[PDB]
A paper describes a structure:
For this purpose, we crystallized the peptides containing the pSer342 and pSer448 motifs (pep-S342 and pep-S448) bound to 14-3-3γΔC (lacking the 15 flexible residues at the C-terminus). The 14-3-3γ isoform was selected based on crystal quality. However, only the motif with Ser448 has a proline residue at +2 position, thus resembling the canonical 14-3-3 binding motif I (RSXpSXP). Lastly, we determined that pep-S448 binds to all 14-3-3 isoforms in the low micromolar range, showing the lowest KD values (∼6.1 and 7.2 μM) when bound to isoforms η and γ, respectively. In addition, the KD values of synthetic phosphorylated peptides are two orders of magnitude higher than those of recombinant Nedd4-2 variants, indicating simultaneous binding of two motifs and/or the participation of regions other than phosphorylated motifs in the formation of the complex. Overall, these results support our hypothesis that the pSer448 motif is the dominant 14-3-3 binding motif. The final electron densities of both peptides allowed us to trace seven of ten amino acids (Leu338 – Thr344) of pep-S342 and (Pro444 – Pro450) pep-S448. In both cases, we were unable to trace the last three residues of each peptide, presumably due to disorder. The phosphate group, the main-chain conformation and other contacts in the 14-3-3-binding groove of both motifs were recognized similarly to those previously observed in other 14-3-3 protein complexes. Similar contacts between the phosphopeptide and 14-3-3 were also observed in the 14-3-3γΔC:pep-S448 complex. The main difference is the absence of water-mediated contacts between Arg445 (-5 residue with the respect to pSer448) and the side chains of the 14-3-3 residues Arg57, Arg61 and Glu136.
Numbering used by the authors:
A (entry chain A): 3 to 69, 72 to 234
B (entry chain E): 444 to 450
C (entry chain C): 3 to 70, 73 to 234
D (entry chain G): 445 to 449
The structure:
């Protein structure tokens, strides 16, 4: 059965039906067994595409919303549509965070550092997506949850993972983005990204032919963000 | 343009 | 309000949410008033994108189906996923055809030849999409409905529309595709496409810049099909 | 595949 749900996720991905792909991997996760590296990637790709479509739509509508003719009826329609997409995005994030808290982070053994960092980074990511759309009083809690997940992931990867590991590099990338875009803290964002970049550069001789691409891709993104920010 | 996260 | 539903369709398009876009224009259609050319285009774009996503997914899965080897388990999962996508596609087509039969074609006045050709072509299109996935006896019925809708549109367009008109050219393009791909009648397909092309050439010197572009675009597709078929 | 509109 499990292999058939995973095959279904692979088919849904080929058909670019990411709602189906996420539903299949959600079912696999709820079987309460650890995910293989391929299953973990399939789960991550599925929900990244599902939430990414909601995030992209929200950014378009929110940008259009800030635009006036004095037509209170047009503004009301635009803001109600934004709220509809917003609630869809929040429901996706709530589903992923429940999977992380109830199954994925939970089933990680004390020494399963790579999976722990991967899932904690994911937890920080999806609270960050909640923080992107939250306003007013409700925003502070999801910002705090995002920083807390990223911080724990950062401490584990710093102690136990090589600086060139793609999961450690990607954690620093998204954590630095959190500081810049969510916390409006460019000095902290630049320090985190530059330290991770330089720590990986110092050990570039350690990458193999197969590993080099995953790490150098993130290293280019770290440099691109630093170039943008400075 | 805008900050880039992991793809 | 009607103006806000049309604005919602434009907002949904910018947000690339074509299910929402089709739902908005479906609501506009069900107000039982004629569609403007702008509203008619929004309705057509919405459902073309909705059904086009289902069609693209179906072809990916169906192609994999014709590659699954002799594995009974794998064949059942792929074919069951194909059938799920198929039923989604058929439900979209059924929604469009009900809109055409109950509102759009029905509300055309006797002198609204352009709208009649537009909607009958649309009726032929969406029955053709049903024929793409149907087998056995269910295929023959939708093939006959498709040919019947295309036949009326072509007869009206030949009598009442200029050969250079993009709706008449687009009808001839899709009707010839129906002959080649659905009826497996390449001789009929080639004659129809070449006749429509030659009929439009005789008066192309008469178009202005805006009409020249729309017509030559479809004429290029007619030529591309003729080259492919030969 | 043949091109439609």
């Amino acid at each position: 059965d499990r292999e058939q749900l995973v095959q279904k996720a692979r088919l849904a991905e080929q058909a670019e039906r990411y709602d189906d792909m996420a539903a299949a991997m959600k079912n696999v996760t709820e079987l309460n067994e650890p995910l293989s590296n391929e299953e973990r990637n399939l789960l991550s790709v599925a929900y990244k595409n599902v939430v990414g479509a909601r995030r992209s739509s929200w950014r378009v509508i929110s940008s259009i919303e800030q635009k006036a003719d004095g037509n209170e009826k047009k503004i009301e329609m635009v803001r109600a549509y934004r709220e509809k997409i917003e609630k869809e995005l929040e429901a996706v994030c709530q589903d992923v965070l429940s999977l992380l808290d109830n199954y994925l982070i939970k089933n990680c053994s004390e020494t399963q550092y790579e999976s722990k960092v991967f899932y904690l980074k994911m937890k920080g990511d999806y609270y960050r997506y909640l923080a992107e759309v939250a306003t007013g009083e409700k925003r502070a809690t999801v910002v705090e949850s995002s920083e807390k997940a990223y911080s724990e992931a950062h401490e584990i990867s710093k102690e136990h993972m090589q600086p060139t590991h793609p999961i450690r590099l990607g954690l620093a990338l998204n954590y630095s983005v959190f500081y810049y875009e969510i916390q409006n803290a460019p000095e902290q964002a630049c320090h985190l990204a530059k330290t991770a970049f330089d720590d990986a550069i110092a050990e570039l001789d350690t990458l193999n032919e197969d590993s080099y691409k995953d790490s150098t891709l993130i290293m280019q993104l770290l440099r691109d963000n630093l170039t943008l920010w400075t | 343009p805008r900050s880039l996260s992991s793809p």
